[PDB]
Amino acid sequence: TMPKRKFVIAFHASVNTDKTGKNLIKELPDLQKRGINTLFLEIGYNYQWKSDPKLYNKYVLSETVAREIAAECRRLSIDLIPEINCLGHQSWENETFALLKAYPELDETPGLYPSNKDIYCRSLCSSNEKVYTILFGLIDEITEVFSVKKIHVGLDEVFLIGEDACPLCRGKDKAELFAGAVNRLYDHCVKKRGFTMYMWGDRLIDSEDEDSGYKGEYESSCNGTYPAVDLIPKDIIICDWHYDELERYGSIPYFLNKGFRVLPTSFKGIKAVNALIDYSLLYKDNPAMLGHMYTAWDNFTNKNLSRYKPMVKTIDKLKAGN
Ligand code: NA
Numbered sequence: 001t002m003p004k005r006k007f008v009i010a011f012h013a014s015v016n017t018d019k020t021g022k023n024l025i026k027e028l029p030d031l032q033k034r035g036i037n038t039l040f041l042e043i044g045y046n047y048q049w050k051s052d053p054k055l056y057n058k059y060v061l062s063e064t065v066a067r068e069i070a071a072e073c074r075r076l077s078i079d080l081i082p083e084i085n086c087l088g089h090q091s092w093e094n095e096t097f098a099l100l101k102a103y104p105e106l107d108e109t110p111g112l113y114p115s116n117k118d119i120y121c122r123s124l125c126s127s128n129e130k131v132y133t134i135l136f137g138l139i140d141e142i143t144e145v146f147s148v149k150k151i152h153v154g155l156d157e158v159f160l161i162g163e164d165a166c167p168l169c170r171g172k173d174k175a176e177l178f179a180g181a182v183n184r185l186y187d188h189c190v191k192k193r194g195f196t197m198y199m200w201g202d203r204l205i206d207s208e209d210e211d212s213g214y215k216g217e218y219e220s221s222c223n224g225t226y227p228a229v230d231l232i233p234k235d236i237i238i239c240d241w242h243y244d245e246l247e248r249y250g251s252i253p254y255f256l257n258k259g260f261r262v263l264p265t266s267f268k269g270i271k272a273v274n275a276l277i278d279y280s281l282l283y284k285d286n287p288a289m290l291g292h293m294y295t296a297w298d299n300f301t302n303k304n305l306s307r308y309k310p311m312v313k314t315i316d317k318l319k320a321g322n
């Protein structure tokens with residue numbers, strides 16, 4: 001009653017240095033043997049950029065190691081997708097990342113939140129043309145370094161958008177601002193470059209919807225971007241994170257019924273990971289439910305990723321297919 005198919009069986013890992021890149025390379029054969037066929041590689045700004053040399057840092061991932069990662073993924077038939085957050089997560093704790101350190105004027109809230117106090121993290125201004133000039137150059141560079149035609153543009157961790165402090169965005173509708181950013185990125189990545197574009201679904205969900213929302217452990221933040229879900233192209237692939245153990249994960253049919261392809265993503269805990277996989281397999285006959293993406297909760301080095309117990313104990317459910 002439906003053609004047999006092979007799921008996306010993905011692992012998310014971050015690389016920010018040559019060392020963490022080499023650690024990952026050592027684990028790739030064992031990941032493939034487990035059944036992983038896809039790697040989402042979070043780079044952010046942690047690459048030795050040539051396109052905008054002001055963002056270069058001598059301690060982050062090199063070109064040489066980056067190309068090695070890509071060559072090992074090609075050899076093993078692992079589909080490699082680099083991830084750069086193109087609007088959110090522009091800082092962490094009291095550290096501001098390379099783009100806003102070099103260009104403070106591209107911040108959505110210039111002059112506010114010293115040391116990022118009272119906010120989770122900073123956002124770029126979604127109306128500033130220079131933001132897109134820089135970002136398109138980084139997307140072009142990182143896809144060429146990894147020799148790929150896929151890109152994950154992030155877009156979670158956007159907590160500041162349409163802020164009173166912003167002279168371009170103040171007063172403006174938050175859903176239109178966010179859809180505008182997505183559509184600018186789509187026009188470059190998909191229309192011009194021909195890539196497949198992925199993003200996180202966080203900002204597309206009504207956090208106050210009892211079925212699809214109430215995800216985070218805190219009712220904090222604003223919930224004004226979600227109507228953008230109806231304003232963006234439906235060939236963008238939505239990675240949909242969960243961390244709880246539930247019998248139903250309502251954001252999955254939410255996105256499927258809005259016409260998107262969805263990649264449910266888990267985190268910590270065998271029981272929670274298994275619960276999300278089992279729920280998603282209720283949709284196994286829907287080709288838009290692409291598979292699963294694992295994340296290794298407390299792993300900052302990439303050592304031993306192929307032995308991550310929630311993956312080891314559940315991946316055979318996905319190797320079985322639909
Ligand atoms: Na990184």
Ligand code: NA
Pocket residue numbers: 066067070071144145146147
């Ligand atoms: Na390459």
Ligand SMILES: [Zn+2]
Pocket residue numbers: 088089090091092120121157
């Ligand atoms: Zn963040």
Ligand SMILES: [Zn+2]
Pocket residue numbers: 107108124125126127128162163166167168169170
């Ligand atoms: Zn702005």
